[PDB]
Amino acid sequence: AIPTMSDVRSFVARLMAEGDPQQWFPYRVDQILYWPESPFVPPIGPFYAPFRPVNFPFTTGSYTVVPDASRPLRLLPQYRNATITVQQADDAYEDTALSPLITTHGFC
Amino acid sequence: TYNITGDGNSFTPTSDMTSTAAPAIDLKPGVLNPTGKLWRPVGTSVATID
């Protein structure tokens, strides 16, 4: 609703990373999606679309308003046919691991 | 070209020189390819690689 200092600073931090879009724009115009989902009226200065219909997926759908779930979540690892080499697997684990950490034993 | 009706002409058929021409060539589909069709970055400058 009114965005928190916290959230803005988060969002900005995220933004100021890497990776580049597909539909660029000329600075002489606003370019509003050629796939006509967008409700594009006739605006003063924007022409329409990006000038260049390329190729990329799209679709329509609303967002499920789901609250912050104060519980850890389980995952069924349904598999896809792209099968990495053991060493790389391992490696990437090594790369992303939060481990080591001090294990709560619990009870035997 | 030379007058055929002259002297000096050899009639030497040898194993070495076994008649041949090019009777037919390979035209297998598989063989037709090599390869890549030529394309362009939409048509604009070096940006549209995508």
A81 touches chain B (CB under 8 A): no
Under 8 Å between Cβ of A49 and A29: no
Closest CA to A52 of A28, A76, A24, A29: A24
Closest CA to A31 of A73, A22, B40: A22
**Rounded Cα gap, residues A67 and A56, in angstroms:** 31
Chain A CB contacts of B42 below 8 Å: 52, 54
| Resolution number, Å | 4.5
- Counting every residue written for chain A, the total comes to 108
CA A81-A86-A90 angle, 5° bins: 115
**Rounded Cα gap, residues A39 and A33, in angstroms:** 10
The nearest alpha carbon in chain B to A21 belongs to B50
Under 8 Å between Cβ of A43 and A18: no
- Counting every residue written for chain B, the total comes to 50
The string of DSSP letters for B5-36 reads S-S-------GGG-----------HHHH---P
